[PDB]
Ligand SMILES: O=C(Nc1cncc2cnccc12)[C@@H]1CCOc2ccc(Cl)cc21
Ligand SMILES: O=C(Nc1cncc2cnccc12)[C@@H]1CCOc2ccc(Cl)cc21
């Protein structure tokens with residue numbers, strides 16, 4: 102019993118965190134095999150950040166301009182290349198702690214663990230979701246760039262995010278491990294803003310199924326809804342549209358609890374209309390949207 | 404910017420998790436130096452749990468009755484003894500991944516990270532607090548016994564909790580690593596219940612300071628209060644009493660934000676008496692009490708653990 106915002110154990114990723122320094126700038130790098138991945142803005146000074154020409158800034162650097170520190174050991178950079186917004190530094194030592202890993206680009210609504218780091222040293226681990234507006238609501242201070250997001254389903258680390266920047270609203274933007282930004286963001290100091298965010302409907306439904314699995318049914322009602330009528334209502338509360346894919350994905354949770362997906366949608370419609378009336382659901386007075394259907398099944402009893 | 408429920412990096416503890424099997428029961432053990440610590444109830448059948456005589460149940464076991472698996476390697480148990488509600492299995496190999504560690508008993512209100520494990524394999528990490536009623540609001544399924552709670556202070560892992568049981572309300576009970584239970588609980592299948600809980604006042608104040616640091620100020624007001632008047636309101640709302648020690652501990656956050664501790668107490672008093680009026684604080688509609696003043700300072704300063 103219980104339901105917590107649970108992160109993956111971070112040890113496999115801690116053994117990959119290194120410090121990358123280029124001139125006066127220091128940030129984090131991810132050391133996998135003989136390559137260290139980090140945000141390409143490590144080659145920029147604060148001045149270069151409005152309209153950096155990364156190809157021009159990079160051509161001026163030699164391997165010895167990159168200082169990579171792994172614990173108390175300096176690694177030797179023997180090559181460098183840029184892939185999109187990530188810089189890849191080839192080093193002369195393969196990381197002996199390299200776990201089984203893959204690079205995966207995720208979709209909005211997907212969750213992942215973030216290992217926040219400073220100076221190549223891990224500070225904390227927390228669970229995040231890629232918001233519908235392609236930002237993440239992280240907890241990052243100056244020096245956290247290059248911290249990564251990941252999942253560890255079945256012993257393989259799937260790296261899905263590398264931290265690059267904080268937007269004016271205090272939310273965060275980054276890339277996948279191939280250096281492609283999530284969303285319409287650029288690694289430039291030019292005026293950029295997070296778009297209007299919405300609630301991840303499929304995740305709220307998954308979390309209502311988690312509440313039913315954990316013994317809470319107060320919010321259920323005798324009604325059902327069509328998928329279209331649900332979407333017309335939910336969008337009035339700034340909820341993402343629920344697709345037939347989301348309905349299919351919720352099938353296993355629907356079968357386990359005996360509550361049809363559109364019946365749970367009717368419950369959600371009623372919660373949006375009524376609020377909680379002084380009650381809580383899984384210790385929350387708000388509808389939680391940072392648990393996916395997969396997270397609920399993984400955490401909850403069967 | 405941002406403020407998340409953040410756990411310590413778990414790698415140092417992951418390297419200590421092992422699987423302990425005794426007969427039909429499998430649970431988790433903590434392998435530090437040449438000893439594996441686990442709940443003593445690993446030796447009980449379901450019927451033994453009804454009224455166990457642990458000394459008597461243990462005298463019937465030999466070292467070979469305890470199968471300890473560290474990853475894909477079977478460790479050899481060469482001794483066994485009980486300390487309170489923990490069983491200590493001496494093994495023939497010191498854990499090469501043993502971090503610098505201590506065993507510490509925490510007080511209610513203190514937070515810690517839990518590394519939830521099943522079959523000696525870490526599954527997740529989360530943060531929680533020792534409630535004033537000595538339970539933890541954990542997330543644990545069957546097989547999670549022996550999962551541990553810890554803090555990291557500098558390069559030292561302070562182990563403070565070992566999971567033993569789930570109470571009927573779905574909250575959890577366990578011991579320190581010396582096998583002493585937190586709370587008036589016993590390791591027996593008998594009627595037990597979590598007592599009425601209270602809110603950890605000093606932690607709510609710390610989280611209000613975290614909200615101010617992160618740019619949320621709507622709850623601030625021009626008022627102040629005395630510690631006695633604030634404590635009268637705390638008692639009324641099932642909040643733990645705030646001591647002068649708690650005020651002193653909140654001193655740094657008070658100096659940073661410019662909001663005196665008793666000034667923040669008047670904001671909390673108003674929140675208790677009036678509610679949030681449709682507003683949220685750090686994305687929450689409830690007053691959060693599972694961040695200590697130290698957690699707030701640590702998260703807002705970026706302290707690392709290499
Ligand atoms: O966002 C950035 N720094 C940080 C990241 N995350 C959290 C933080 C918190 N507080 C200050 C700084 C932070 C850098 C510096 C600002 O301007 C830019 C512009 C583009 C890029 Cl790609 C990075 C940055
Ligand atoms: O609580 C216990 N098991 C678990 C712990 N945590 C979470 C769980 C979730 N779901 C089922 C079981 C769980 C065991 C089994 C029940 O009877 C007792 C009685 C005393 C003692 Cl010390 C332990 C136990």
Ligand SMILES: [Cl-]
Pocket residue numbers: 206207208211
């Ligand atoms: Cl995805």
